């Protein structure tokens, strides 16, 4: 019964035009195997697009837009059809004019369109949707705010390329309020949108900080739902890729104790992101490395370095290694790391199959040795305590083998460690290793 419907939708009688649009909208709503393909191939999209113009009944506009939305929320190719019919600008102008039911349809449509790819995202923005979308967050209608937030986050999503910052940054003031919503889905989507916005240059991080977002985000790290934790954690982590002052705002908002909580999350990936986040704080200045230690984060970090999944261990190793940087100007830090038992896990990690981490791990071990060496030379002792700890943990053997690694920098640092801190007993090797090695 479809070629009939296609003709009833062409009738100049406004009465039949509606009846037809309504029948389309209904089959297009079937839960199981919607007939989106068949309806598209009957050529009726452009006809439905016309039914959304200003010069049309409020009741017809609704049904046409609802039908099209059902199409645009299908496959990437069925969304493409709706976009190629120039439906976006009419969806957009319906956000101003239309009633609330109509607004909710168009906002959902534009969300599905904006979420298909970075091109469609830019396209929605170029068609000046930002202005009307923001205007929706007055409605005090929970389901509409929920939807508008979902769409909003899709306009911010994507790093390569980033969206036009001068446009998407206009949403910061609204989001700043949205992360106070009591509707979980809203809250979640608002946090995603912030995680995307904060994921960029120092100018973007600063925008996030200047609307006072970071205070609230830190509070949200202890929300009961991991659906909130995740994006919130991520936004906070992105802020701390920034400079020392930026990082300091998040520490000042209470992020270290919240990170403590997350280092014992049931989800492995929350723990991984938490480690990453802490590692970017121990990459910070000496006060901040001390703040990390004062928040009792080292002990769980060390525990994860020994028993966590590999991806989590690498991130934890960064956190502990970055922290030993500050050990050359504050030797208390290294002493505390050592005493917390981080030597054996760092050593055991040298055999991981990742040269990026082996390097970081050797840098951490060198810093521990340099502090152990300056410790014994400062008080006329004849032994490097830290060197003996590394030796007794089978770390000497492991560092020794790193000289048989293909990366020249790894070999060179390992060679240096064996010569400097293990002098009489373990030879360093020079370059007859012309049959190279690694992978």
């Amino acid at each position: 019964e479809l070629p009939q419907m296609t003709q009833q939708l062409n009738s100049d009688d406004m009465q039949e035009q509606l009846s037809a649009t309504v029948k389309f909208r209904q089959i297009l709503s079937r839960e199981h195997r919607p007939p989106i393909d068949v309806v598209i191939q009957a050529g009726v999209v452009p006809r439905l697009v016309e039914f959304m113009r200003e010069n049309q009944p409020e009741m017809l506009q609704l049904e046409a837009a609802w039908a099209l939305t059902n199409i645009a929320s299908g496959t990437s190719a069925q969304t493409k059809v709706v976009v190629d019919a120039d439906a976006v600008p009419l969806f957009i102008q319906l956000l101003y004019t239309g009633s609330v039911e109509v607004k909710e349809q168009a906002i959902w449509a534009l969300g599905n369109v904006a979420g298909d790819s970075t091109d469609y995202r830019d396209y929605v923005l170029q068609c000046n949707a930002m202005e009307p979308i923001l205007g929706l967050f007055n409605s005090n209608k929970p389901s509409l705010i929920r939807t508008a937030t979902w769409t909003l986050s899709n306009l911010c999503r994507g790093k390569k390329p980033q969206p036009d910052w001068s446009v998407v940054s206009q949403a910061l003031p609204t989001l700043a309020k949205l992360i106070y919503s009591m509707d979980t889905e809203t809250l979640v989507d608002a946090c995603w949108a912030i995680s995307y916005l904060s994921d960029g240059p120092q100018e973007a991080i600063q925008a996030v900080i200047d609307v006072r977002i970071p205070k609230r985000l830190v509070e949200l790290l202890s929300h009961e739902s991991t659906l909130v934790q995740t994006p919130a954690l991520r936004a906070v982590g992105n802020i701390v890729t920034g400079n020392d002052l930026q990082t300091q705002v998040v520490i000042n908002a209470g992020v270290l104790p919240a990170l403590r909580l997350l280092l014992s999350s049931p989800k492995e990936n929350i723990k991984k992101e938490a480690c990453w986040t802490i590692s970017n704080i121990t990459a910070g200045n000496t006060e901040q490395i001390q703040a990390v230690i004062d928040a009792n984060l080292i002990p769980p970090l060390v525990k994860l370095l020994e028993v966590a999944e590999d991806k989590t261990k690498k991130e934890a190793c960064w956190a502990i290694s970055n922290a030993s940087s500050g050990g050359l100007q504050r030797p208390d830090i290294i002493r505390y790391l050592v005493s917390q038992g981080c030597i054996k896990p760092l050593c055991d990690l040298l055999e991981i199959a990742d040269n990026r981490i082996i390097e970081v791990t050797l840098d951490a071990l060198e810093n521990i040795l340099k502090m152990g060496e300056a410790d014994k030379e400062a008080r006329g002792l004849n032994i490097n305590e830290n060197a003996d700890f590394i030796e007794k943990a089978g770390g000497m053997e492991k560092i020794f083998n790193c000289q048989q690694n293909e990366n020249d920098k790894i070999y060179e640092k390992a060679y240096k460690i064996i010569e400097t801190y293990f002098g009489e007993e373990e030879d360093a090797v020079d370059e007859t290793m012309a049959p190279q090695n690694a992978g």
């Binding site: 999503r157 982590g237 701390v240 890729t241 989800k267 992101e273």
Partner: peptide
């Protein structure tokens, strides 16, 4: 301070 994440991802639709 030091390191971007491996991928922005942590996107709502793709993550875990």
């Amino acid at each position: 301070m030091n390191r971007r994440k491996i991928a922005m991802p942590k996107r709502r639709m793709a993550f875990k």
